[PDB]
Structures are given as structure tokens and as C-alpha cells.
Amino acid sequence: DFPLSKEYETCVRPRKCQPPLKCNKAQICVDPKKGW
Questions:
Q1: Which residues lie across from 30 on neighbouring strands?
Q2: Which cysteines are joined by disulfide bonds?
Q3: Beta strand spans in the chain (E)
């Protein structure tokens, strides 16, 4: 359906982070596992 991405980038409604990521509020998605 959607392209989606990993780490800091975006995670809107239609863009639900597949992997175990964590957003903030401005749609970014991230985690201590990989990124920061």
C-alpha cells in the first residue's frame, strides 16, 4: 500500500512503521537500537 521507511523519516497514519520503531509527534520514528 505505502512505501514506508526505517529510522528517522516519517510515520503518518498510512505510514505505520513496520519494524520496532518509535515516533515522537512530528512523524519521524526512531529507536536506540539503530539511529539516535
A1: 22
A2: 11-23, 17-29
A3: none
Number of domains comprising the chain: 1
Secondary structure letter of residue 30 according to DSSP: B
Place of cell 512523524: 27
Nearest in space to 20 (alpha carbons), one of 2, 10, 33:
33
Length of the chain: 36
Which residues does the chain break after (C to N > 2.5 Å)?
A: none
Per the CB < 8 A criterion, the answer to whether 1 and 17 are in contact is no
Q: Which residue has 520503531 as its cell numbers?
A: 21
| Cβ partners under 8 Å of residue 12, min gap 6 | 27
